[PDB]
Design a protein around this ligand. Structure first.
Ligand SMILES: [Fe+3]
Ligand SMILES: [Fe+3]
Ligand SMILES: [Fe+3]
Ligand SMILES: [Fe+3]
Ligand SMILES: [Fe+3]
Ligand SMILES: [Fe+3]
Ligand SMILES: [Fe+3]
Ligand SMILES: [Fe+3]
Ligand SMILES: [Fe+3]
Ligand SMILES: [Fe+3]
Ligand SMILES: [Fe+3]
Ligand SMILES: [Fe+3]
Ligand SMILES: [Fe+3]
Ligand SMILES: [Fe+3]
Ligand SMILES: [Fe+3]
Ligand SMILES: [Fe+3]
Ligand SMILES: [Fe+3]
Ligand SMILES: [Fe+3]
Lengths: 167, 167, 167, 167, 167, 167
């Protein structure tokens, strides 16, 4: 009840979600190094959220009597010219993930797989939230052009988002 | 204050820890497919634990004013002849990690890197626990051999261990 | 991320929501004049609800990186021949809001704009409720055709629903 | 508001849901007479859940100002060759309901009936959950091929789920 | 301990109880269509109650080492000329069920099946309550003759009896 | 008890208050668009307050046995050159509402309408507060001429004024 084609498409997205976790982890390491601990914490929390997204794909595949297959996780970029550029890349990256979702939605419509299409509604809606969140910080970073004072401040605000795992 | 060898070595250990997260996750998918939800949830818990280990290097590295670098994470194996064989691989894998910790310890001693070597004590003691914990289960499995009545009971026990994240 | 056709239909639907708030406020004022303070309040509660619906569009717009534009709000009718008529009016108004939404859904599908299509599901569902709830009363006012005892009773019932804001 | 074609199809699904409740009540009796009280209670609770499904249809039909009409409920099977063959029937049956739902979804789309499509969305996700929960147990019964020992411990696990009407 | 006859007769009453539930559900749909929400809830509560009655039979039957057989449940009337006539139809059905209980009892006494006769004692008493319950309402609907304003208040009186399952 | 002219002057001021809600809501969209979420929330709260002022007239008109008549709320401006400019436009708006209220006091005095003139005392005081409330913010904006860091902190302060409706 999953087509061989759809399974590959779902396992592929599961892999994109994990890569997406890892990129944020890479971004955390990058903010860490800049000393911006709040930014860094936000990125870890984001990383954890992406692992969550991956598990959602994992559970759906099992629910549909499929079989998860795990693929290499590409090595993410090490750095970025500035916090603003990191967020630009996060944004571009969320835009990339959405497109993959639409493509998945399209394939599910074409196959007449209502289950998978329904399962994806959740990601269509979550991605709206995901892009808006990244956009909102990206713009504050624009508005903070030649001003470390504001960078410092945003850093403190973002630190309110703590990754749920360590403790 | 970390020599470039040390930094490279901690980073490789960080990546080894992530690979284990992933190998264990790969094991969770293998059990899930067999419909052994107890084992499946044990592997996901084990997988989070490994991410934890990963962050300890992360944390240590930054404390010594290093820079983390994330590397690609290899495709894990997909399948195993049997639950026993997967636990065997897990056991063999932990033995692999323990040897790595020793190689790192020896590295830290030769360089007279007291800080790093202190940092590794935690890993020497944890790896004793890790090895013993997988062996216990692996032995319970040799004991079941040709008894699904026991795999059933083993599954159920193991379901006691659950991953934090989903919640 | 929002096409120009979408942006327009969304602001339009936002202004359509604001005008319902005003229409219902108009009916509140009609009911008040008939001394029917129960109906008048329920209408004021419905206005507040419509403003809520307008804020839902306002938010989705900004989330999709859009720009809200506020247009003029037409003067609503002043009078109706009877309580039954004003509810008939309000039912037809809801059936009209509904079709404005179906129209938005249709546009979204033509443009292959999954996020917007997905965001409207909520409105499709709320409208089912909106229509059913206006209808339940409408029905109770046909039963109460020529008999002010029941009209007087409905009034007390509907005063249960109060507007939250004057608090 | 509801096309004749649509309303008759919804009434037909309502009847389908009731025959489901009846089918599982039939499985409940089949299991009691085997002295599998756990199995029997599971099936009872399932029956109740199906009545709930029938009520969602009833509610939706009335919310669209339609009219429910009840058709006769056919006599269900009395017996199955074994607990496994019984769960095979249930699984084959949940698939049949899924198809009925997909067919309905296709009909709503074809007639541009957005409201009914949105309503059916809950059944597309619920059926995913339905088929999975029957498959987990179906597979457990395969894994207990010739083994009353496991059958007995399944019966005891299933007894956790219990019908609410005795209360 | 149950003769072929008693088993047959009992499995038959079980079915009538089920049909009874179905019939009340049918009147629930009828009252709901008229916009009589109170009356409609009352009838759904009565339907569950009848399912409860079926369960007592089901439980007695397995108590005596019998086997429950389920039979098809016939189409009930869609429609009544008025609320009063539904209630007349209701009452007549309750007397019909009572008569079938008495025959059951009488067959018990004849075969000298003390256990079965004793089981029915519950139903003998419950039926007294059932008929009285229906008659009170029946009679109040007569008292309401040409008074929508009374029917309104009766509906509101009845909304206090609510079905339990939806929760 | 209300002169034909008074009612008209009261209904106009009612409408003026609604237009105020709209104006402030426009300025909300404006600030939202700049990503100044705190100004945006302030403005949404003030929008609500304005709706409150309208209801005050609405209540008075019905107390004195008048009828409320609602008029078209015109299109407010979409844009302003800067946040400071918006607050200048709002001060100017409030000053005009004030003038509007004096004209109403003068009228009621001149018509020797004592009820109406006393009703307005509330507004004469409220406008003092309104004007000053805007002036304080407007002046802080002058104070923060070419300093985005002060714009930022002022945004965080105003964020404390939350509208009361999203809940
Ligand atoms: Fe994601
Ligand atoms: Fe994401
Ligand atoms: Fe998110
Ligand atoms: Fe480890
Ligand atoms: Fe380990
Ligand atoms: Fe451990
Ligand atoms: Fe609305
Ligand atoms: Fe509405
Ligand atoms: Fe509503
Ligand atoms: Fe169902
Ligand atoms: Fe089902
Ligand atoms: Fe279910
Ligand atoms: Fe009964
Ligand atoms: Fe009865
Ligand atoms: Fe009773
Ligand atoms: Fe005002
Ligand atoms: Fe004001
Ligand atoms: Fe004020």
């Amino acid at each position: 009840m999953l087509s061989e084609r759809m399974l590959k498409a779902l396992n592929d997205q599961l892999n994109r979600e994990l890569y997406s976790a890892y990129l944020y982890f890479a971004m955390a390491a990058y903010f860490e190094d800049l000393g911006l601990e709040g930014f860094a914490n936000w990125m870890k929390a984001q990383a954890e959220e992406e692992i969550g997204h991956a598990l959602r794909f994992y559970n759906y595949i099992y629910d549909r009597n499929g079989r998860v297959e795990l693929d290499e996780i590409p090595k993410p970029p090490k750095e970025w010219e500035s916090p603003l550029k990191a967020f630009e890349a996060a944004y571009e990256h969320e835009k990339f993930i959405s497109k993959s979702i639409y493509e998945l939605a399209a394939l599910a419509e074409e196959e007449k797989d209502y289950s998978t299409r329904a399962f994806l509604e959740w990601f269509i809606n979550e991605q709206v939230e995901e892009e808006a969140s990244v956009k909102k910080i990206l713009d504050k970073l624009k508005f903070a052009k030649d001003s470390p004072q504001i960078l410092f401040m945003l850093d403190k605000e973002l630190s309110a988002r703590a990754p749920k795992l360590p403790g």
